[PDB]
Short mmCIF file of C-alpha atoms and ligand atoms in Angstrom, two decimals:
data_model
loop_
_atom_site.label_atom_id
_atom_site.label_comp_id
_atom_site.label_asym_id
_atom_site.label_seq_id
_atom_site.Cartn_x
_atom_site.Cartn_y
_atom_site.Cartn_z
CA UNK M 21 10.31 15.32 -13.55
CA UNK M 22 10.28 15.01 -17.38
CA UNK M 23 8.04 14.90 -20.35
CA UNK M 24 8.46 11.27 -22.12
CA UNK M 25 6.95 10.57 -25.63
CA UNK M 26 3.78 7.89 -25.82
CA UNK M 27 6.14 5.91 -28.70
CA UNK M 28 9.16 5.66 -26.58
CA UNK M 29 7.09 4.36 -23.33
CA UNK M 30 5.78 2.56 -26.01
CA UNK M 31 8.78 1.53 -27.38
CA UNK M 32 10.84 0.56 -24.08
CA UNK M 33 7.38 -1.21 -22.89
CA UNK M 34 7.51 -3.76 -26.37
CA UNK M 35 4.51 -2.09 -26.71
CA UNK M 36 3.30 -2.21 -23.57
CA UNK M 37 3.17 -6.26 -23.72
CA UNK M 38 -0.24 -7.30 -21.92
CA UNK M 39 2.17 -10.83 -20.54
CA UNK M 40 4.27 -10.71 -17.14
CA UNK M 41 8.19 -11.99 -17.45
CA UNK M 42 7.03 -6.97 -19.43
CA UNK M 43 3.95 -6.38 -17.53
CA UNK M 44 4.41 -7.00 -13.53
CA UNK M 45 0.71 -5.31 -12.22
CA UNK M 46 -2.66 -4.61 -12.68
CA UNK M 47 -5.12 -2.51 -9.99
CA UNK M 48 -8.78 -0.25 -11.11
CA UNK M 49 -6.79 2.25 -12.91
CA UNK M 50 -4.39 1.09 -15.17
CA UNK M 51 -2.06 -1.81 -15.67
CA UNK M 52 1.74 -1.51 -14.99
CA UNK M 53 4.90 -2.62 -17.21
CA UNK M 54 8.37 -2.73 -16.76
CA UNK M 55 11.12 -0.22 -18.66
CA UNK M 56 14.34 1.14 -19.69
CA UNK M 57 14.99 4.48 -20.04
CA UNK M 58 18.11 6.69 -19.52
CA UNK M 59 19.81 3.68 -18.10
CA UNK M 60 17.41 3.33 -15.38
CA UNK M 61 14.64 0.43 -14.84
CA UNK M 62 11.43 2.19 -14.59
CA UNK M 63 7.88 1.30 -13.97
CA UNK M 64 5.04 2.31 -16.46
CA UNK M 65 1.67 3.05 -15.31
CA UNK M 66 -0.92 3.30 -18.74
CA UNK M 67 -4.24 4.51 -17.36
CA UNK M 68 -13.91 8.89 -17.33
CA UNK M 69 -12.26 12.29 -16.58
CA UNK M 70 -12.34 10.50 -13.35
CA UNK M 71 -9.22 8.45 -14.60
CA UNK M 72 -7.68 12.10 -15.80
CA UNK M 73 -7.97 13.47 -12.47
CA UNK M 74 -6.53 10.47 -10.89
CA UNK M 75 -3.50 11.38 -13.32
CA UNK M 76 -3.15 15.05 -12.43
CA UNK M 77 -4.04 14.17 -8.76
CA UNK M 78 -1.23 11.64 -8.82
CA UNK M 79 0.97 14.30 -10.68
CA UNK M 80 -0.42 16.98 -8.40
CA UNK M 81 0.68 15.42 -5.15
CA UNK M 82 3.64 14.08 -6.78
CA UNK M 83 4.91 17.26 -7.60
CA UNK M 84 4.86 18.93 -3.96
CA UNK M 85 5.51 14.58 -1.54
CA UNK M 86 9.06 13.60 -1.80
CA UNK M 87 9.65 11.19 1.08
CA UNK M 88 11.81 8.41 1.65
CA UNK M 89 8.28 6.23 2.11
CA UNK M 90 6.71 7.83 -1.35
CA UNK M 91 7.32 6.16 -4.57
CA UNK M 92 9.17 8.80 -6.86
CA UNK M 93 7.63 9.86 -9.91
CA UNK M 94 9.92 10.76 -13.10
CA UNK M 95 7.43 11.77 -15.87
CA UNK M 96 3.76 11.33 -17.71
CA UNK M 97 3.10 11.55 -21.23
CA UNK M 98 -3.50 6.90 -23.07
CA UNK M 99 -2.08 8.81 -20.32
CA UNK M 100 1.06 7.62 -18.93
CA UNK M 101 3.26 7.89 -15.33
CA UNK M 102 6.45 6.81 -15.18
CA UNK M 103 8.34 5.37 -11.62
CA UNK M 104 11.68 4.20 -10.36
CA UNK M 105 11.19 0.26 -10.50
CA UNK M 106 10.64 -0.89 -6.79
CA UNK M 107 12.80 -4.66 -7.37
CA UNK M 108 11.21 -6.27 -4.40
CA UNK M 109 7.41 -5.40 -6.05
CA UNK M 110 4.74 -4.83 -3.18
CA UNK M 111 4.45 -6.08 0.41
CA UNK M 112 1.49 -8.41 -0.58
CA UNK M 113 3.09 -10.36 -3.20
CA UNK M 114 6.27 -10.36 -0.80
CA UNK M 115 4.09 -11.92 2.37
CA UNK M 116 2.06 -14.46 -0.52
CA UNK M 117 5.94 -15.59 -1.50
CA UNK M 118 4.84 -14.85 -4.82
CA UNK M 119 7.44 -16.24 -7.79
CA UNK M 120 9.20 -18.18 -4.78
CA UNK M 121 10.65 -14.98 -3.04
CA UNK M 122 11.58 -16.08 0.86
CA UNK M 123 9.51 -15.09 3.58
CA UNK M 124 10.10 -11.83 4.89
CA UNK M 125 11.96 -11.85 8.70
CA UNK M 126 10.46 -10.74 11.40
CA UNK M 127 12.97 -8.04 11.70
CA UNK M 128 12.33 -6.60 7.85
CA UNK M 129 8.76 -6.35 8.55
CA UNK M 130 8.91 -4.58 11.32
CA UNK M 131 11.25 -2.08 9.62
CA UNK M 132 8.39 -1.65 6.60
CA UNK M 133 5.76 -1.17 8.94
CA UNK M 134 7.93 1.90 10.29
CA UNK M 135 9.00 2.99 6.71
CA UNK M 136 4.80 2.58 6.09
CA UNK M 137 3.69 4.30 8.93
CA UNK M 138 6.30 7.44 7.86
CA UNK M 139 4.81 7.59 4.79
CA UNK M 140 1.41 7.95 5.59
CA UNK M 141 2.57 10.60 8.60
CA UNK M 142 4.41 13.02 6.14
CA UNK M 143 0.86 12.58 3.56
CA UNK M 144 -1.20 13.41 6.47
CA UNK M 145 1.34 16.36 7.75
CA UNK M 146 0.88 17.31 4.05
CA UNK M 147 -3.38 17.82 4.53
CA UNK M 148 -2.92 14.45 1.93
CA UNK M 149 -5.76 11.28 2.64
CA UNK M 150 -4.82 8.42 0.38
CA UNK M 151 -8.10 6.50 0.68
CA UNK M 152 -6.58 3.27 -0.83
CA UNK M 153 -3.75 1.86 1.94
CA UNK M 154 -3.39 -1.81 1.31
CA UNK M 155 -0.20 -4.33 1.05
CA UNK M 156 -0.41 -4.12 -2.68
CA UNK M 157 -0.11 -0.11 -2.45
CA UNK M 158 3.21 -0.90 0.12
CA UNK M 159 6.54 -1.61 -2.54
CA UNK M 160 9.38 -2.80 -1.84
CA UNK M 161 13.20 -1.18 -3.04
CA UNK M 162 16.76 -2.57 -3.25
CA UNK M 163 17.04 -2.11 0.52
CA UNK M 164 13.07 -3.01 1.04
CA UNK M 165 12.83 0.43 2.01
CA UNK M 166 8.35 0.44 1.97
CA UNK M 167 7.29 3.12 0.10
CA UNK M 168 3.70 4.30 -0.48
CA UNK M 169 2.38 4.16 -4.14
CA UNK M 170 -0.97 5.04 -5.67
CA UNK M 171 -1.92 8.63 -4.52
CA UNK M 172 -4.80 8.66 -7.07
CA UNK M 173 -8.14 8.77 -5.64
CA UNK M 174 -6.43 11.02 -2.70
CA UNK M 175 -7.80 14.16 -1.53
CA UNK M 176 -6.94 17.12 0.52
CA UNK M 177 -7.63 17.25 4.20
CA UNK M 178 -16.64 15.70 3.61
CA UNK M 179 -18.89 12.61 2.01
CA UNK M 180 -18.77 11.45 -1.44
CA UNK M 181 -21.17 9.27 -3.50
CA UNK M 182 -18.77 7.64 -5.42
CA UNK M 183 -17.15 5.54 -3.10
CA UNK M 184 -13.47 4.00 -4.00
CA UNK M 185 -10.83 1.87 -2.24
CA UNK M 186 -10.55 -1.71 -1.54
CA UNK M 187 -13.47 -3.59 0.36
CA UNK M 188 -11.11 -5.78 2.63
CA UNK M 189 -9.17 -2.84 4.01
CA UNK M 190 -11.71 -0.12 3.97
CA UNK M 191 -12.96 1.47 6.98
CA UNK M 192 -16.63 1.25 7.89
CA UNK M 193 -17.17 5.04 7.74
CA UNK M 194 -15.37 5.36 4.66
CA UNK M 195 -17.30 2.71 2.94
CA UNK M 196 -20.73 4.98 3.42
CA UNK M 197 -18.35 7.81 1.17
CA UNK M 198 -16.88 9.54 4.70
CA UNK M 199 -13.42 10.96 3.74
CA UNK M 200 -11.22 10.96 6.98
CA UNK M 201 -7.47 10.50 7.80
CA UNK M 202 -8.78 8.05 10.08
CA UNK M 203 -9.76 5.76 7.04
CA UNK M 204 -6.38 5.65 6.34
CA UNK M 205 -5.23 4.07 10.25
CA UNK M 206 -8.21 1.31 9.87
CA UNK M 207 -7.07 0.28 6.12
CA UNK M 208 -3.28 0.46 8.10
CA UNK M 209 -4.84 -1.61 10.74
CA UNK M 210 -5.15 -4.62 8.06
CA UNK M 211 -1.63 -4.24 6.68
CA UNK M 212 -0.77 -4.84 10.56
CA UNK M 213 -2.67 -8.25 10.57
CA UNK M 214 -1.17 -9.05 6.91
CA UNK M 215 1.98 -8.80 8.29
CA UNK M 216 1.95 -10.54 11.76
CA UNK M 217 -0.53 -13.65 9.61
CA UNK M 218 0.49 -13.53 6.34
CA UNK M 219 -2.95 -14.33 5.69
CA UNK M 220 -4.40 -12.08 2.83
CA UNK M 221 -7.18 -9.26 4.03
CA UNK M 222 -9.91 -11.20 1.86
CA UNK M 223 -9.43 -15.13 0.90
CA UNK M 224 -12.98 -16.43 -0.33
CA UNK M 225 -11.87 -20.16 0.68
CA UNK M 226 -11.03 -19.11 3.99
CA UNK M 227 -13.70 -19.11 7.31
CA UNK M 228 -13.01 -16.21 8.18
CA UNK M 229 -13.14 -15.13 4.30
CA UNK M 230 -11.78 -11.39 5.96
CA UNK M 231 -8.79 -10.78 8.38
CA UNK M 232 -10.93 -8.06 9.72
CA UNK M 233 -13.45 -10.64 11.32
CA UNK M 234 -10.33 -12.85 12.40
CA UNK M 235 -9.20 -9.62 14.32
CA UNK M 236 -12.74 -9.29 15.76
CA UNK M 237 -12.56 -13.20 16.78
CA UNK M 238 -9.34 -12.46 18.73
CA UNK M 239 -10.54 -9.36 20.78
CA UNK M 240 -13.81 -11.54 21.77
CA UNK M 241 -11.03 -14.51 23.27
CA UNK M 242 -12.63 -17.12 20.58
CA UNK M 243 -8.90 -16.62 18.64
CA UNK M 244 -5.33 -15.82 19.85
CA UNK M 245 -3.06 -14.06 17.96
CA UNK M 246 -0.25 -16.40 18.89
CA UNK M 247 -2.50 -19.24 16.73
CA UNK M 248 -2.53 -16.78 13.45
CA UNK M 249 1.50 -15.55 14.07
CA UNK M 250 3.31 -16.23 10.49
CA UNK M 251 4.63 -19.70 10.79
CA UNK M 252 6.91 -18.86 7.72
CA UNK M 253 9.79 -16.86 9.95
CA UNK M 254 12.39 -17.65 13.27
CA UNK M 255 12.97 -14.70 14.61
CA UNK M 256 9.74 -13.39 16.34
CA UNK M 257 9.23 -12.78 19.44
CA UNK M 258 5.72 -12.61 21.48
CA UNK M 259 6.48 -9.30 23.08
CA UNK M 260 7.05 -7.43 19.67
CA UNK M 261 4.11 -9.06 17.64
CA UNK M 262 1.50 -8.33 20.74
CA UNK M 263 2.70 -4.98 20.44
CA UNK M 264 2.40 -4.54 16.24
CA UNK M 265 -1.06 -6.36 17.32
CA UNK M 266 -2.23 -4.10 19.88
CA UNK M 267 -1.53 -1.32 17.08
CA UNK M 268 -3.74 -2.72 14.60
CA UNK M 269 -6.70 -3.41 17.36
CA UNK M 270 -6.19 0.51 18.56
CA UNK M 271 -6.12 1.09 13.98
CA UNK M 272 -8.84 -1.13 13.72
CA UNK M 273 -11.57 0.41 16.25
CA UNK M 274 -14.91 0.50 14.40
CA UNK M 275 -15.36 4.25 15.76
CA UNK M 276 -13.22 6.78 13.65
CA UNK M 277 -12.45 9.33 16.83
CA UNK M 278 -11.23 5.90 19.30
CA UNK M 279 -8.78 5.87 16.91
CA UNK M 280 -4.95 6.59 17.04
CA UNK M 281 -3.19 9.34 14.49
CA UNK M 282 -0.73 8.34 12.51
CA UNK M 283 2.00 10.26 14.41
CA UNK M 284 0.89 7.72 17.70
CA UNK M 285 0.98 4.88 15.14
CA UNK M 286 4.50 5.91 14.39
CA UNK M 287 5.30 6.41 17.96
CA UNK M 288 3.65 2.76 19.18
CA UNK M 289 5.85 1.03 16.62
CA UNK M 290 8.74 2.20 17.33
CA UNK M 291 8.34 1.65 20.95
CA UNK M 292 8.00 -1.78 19.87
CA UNK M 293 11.75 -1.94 18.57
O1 LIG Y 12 8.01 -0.86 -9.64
C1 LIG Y 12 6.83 -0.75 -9.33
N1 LIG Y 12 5.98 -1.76 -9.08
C2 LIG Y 12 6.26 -3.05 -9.20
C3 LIG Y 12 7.56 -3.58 -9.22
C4 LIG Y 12 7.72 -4.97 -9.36
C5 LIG Y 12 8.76 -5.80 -9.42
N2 LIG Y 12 8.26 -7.04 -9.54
C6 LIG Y 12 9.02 -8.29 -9.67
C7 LIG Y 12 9.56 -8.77 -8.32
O2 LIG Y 12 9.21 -8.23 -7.27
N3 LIG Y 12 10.42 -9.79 -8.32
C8 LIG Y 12 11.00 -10.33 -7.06
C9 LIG Y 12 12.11 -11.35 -7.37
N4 LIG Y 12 11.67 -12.33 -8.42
C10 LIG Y 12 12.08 -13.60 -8.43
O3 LIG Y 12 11.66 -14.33 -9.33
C11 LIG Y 12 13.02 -14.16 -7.33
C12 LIG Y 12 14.14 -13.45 -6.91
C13 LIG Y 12 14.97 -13.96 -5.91
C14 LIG Y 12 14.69 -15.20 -5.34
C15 LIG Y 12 13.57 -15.92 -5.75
C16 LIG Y 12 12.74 -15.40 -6.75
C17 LIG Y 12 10.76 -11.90 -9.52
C18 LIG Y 12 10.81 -10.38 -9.63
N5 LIG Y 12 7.03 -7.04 -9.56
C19 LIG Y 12 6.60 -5.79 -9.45
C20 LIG Y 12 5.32 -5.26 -9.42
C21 LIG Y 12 5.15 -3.89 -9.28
C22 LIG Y 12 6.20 0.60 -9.10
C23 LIG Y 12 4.85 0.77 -9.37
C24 LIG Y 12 4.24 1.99 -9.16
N6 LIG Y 12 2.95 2.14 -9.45
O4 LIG Y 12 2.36 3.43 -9.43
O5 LIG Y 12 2.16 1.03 -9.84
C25 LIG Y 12 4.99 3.06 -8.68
C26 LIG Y 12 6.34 2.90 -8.41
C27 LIG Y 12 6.95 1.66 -8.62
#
């Protein structure tokens, strides 16, 4: 950790520029820009007490989850976290081919659903729910190591009546303010499907417009899987992508308790390799 100035984020952010190349991401809560500082490419997030708690809640489980899978946070200081710069950005952009990356392998998505799954498991082993699991939450290192970002809006491990997360991905429980681990396998359950389709978990041209329903389609033999496999790789194999599938249909059970845990998650995939 460290304690950074406002004018020197400032400063190695060309004041924070609002214009992508120095800015590289924007979710709910604050926009993100690229920096140098100490010799070391960083990632600056600039984020209503609800956005301060979603600081010291980020800072909070920052200080006491260092895994492999987390994102690492170097300092704060307009309230301002600072990252190490994940190169390869997040899974979503990496499956859309965004900026003309190449599709991911087979073989490197199976690894970050395992690197995924890990970091969920030690959050969860940590009384951590992260309420906001998506592909744009997933980023990508120098190795494409995944590792978990965005621990605000987490709690410890209940209803709430101000409901957060992301529509597409959200379970059904946890979209009438439930707050359960097992919102976190369902919203899993669509980063499954976003990696075996490439499809994105909501596209408003699309019939379905949500991978959820194509996933419902499938189990109801109207779809096959097969028909929805990314075309955009070589090197899959039926009897590994049934088996991410079948994952994602056990992640994506409407009922909460039919469920798997995330330590069976982690288990089922790497059964799969
Ligand atoms: O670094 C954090 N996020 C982020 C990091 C990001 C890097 N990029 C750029 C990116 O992936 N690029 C990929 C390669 N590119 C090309 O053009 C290319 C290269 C080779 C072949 C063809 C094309 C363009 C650059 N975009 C990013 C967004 C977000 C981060 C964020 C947080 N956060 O709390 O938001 C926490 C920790 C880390």
């Amino acid at each position: 950790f460290h304690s950074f100035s406002f004018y020197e984020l400032k400063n190695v952010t060309n004041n924070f520029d609002e214009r992508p190349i120095n800015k590289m991401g924007e979710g709910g809560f604050g926009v993100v820009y690229k920096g140098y500082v100490n010799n070391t490419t960083v990632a600056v997030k600039k984020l209503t007490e609800e956005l301060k708690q979603q600081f010291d809640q980020e800072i909070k489980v920052m200080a006491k989850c260092q895994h492999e899978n987390l994102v690492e946070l170097l300092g704060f200081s307009d309230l301002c976290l600072v990252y190490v710069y994940m190169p390869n950005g997040s899974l979503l952009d990496r499956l859309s081919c965004l900026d003309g990356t190449p599709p991911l392998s087979w073989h490197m998505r199976c690894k970050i659903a395992q690197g995924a799954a890990n970091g969920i498991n030690f959050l969860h082993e940590n009384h951590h729910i992260h309420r906001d699991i998506k592909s744009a939450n997933i980023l990508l290192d120098e190795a494409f190591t995944a590792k978990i970002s965005d621990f605000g809006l987490a709690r410890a491990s209940v209803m709430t009546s101000r409901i957060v997360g992301t529509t597409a991905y959200m379970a059904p429980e946890a979209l009438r303010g439930e707050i359960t681990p097992k919102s976190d396998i369902y919203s899993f359950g669509v980063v499954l499907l976003e990696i075996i389709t490439g499809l994105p978990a909501v596209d408003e041209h699309r019939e379905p417009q949500l991978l959820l329903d194509i996933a419902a389609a499938i189990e109801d033999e109207e779809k096959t899987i097969e028909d929805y496999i990314d075309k955009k790789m070589n090197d899959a194999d039926s009897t590994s992508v049934e088996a991410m599938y079948s994952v994602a249909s056990q992640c994506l059970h409407e009922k909460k308790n039919k469920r798997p845990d995330i330590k069976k998650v982690q288990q089922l995939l790497q059964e799969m390799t």
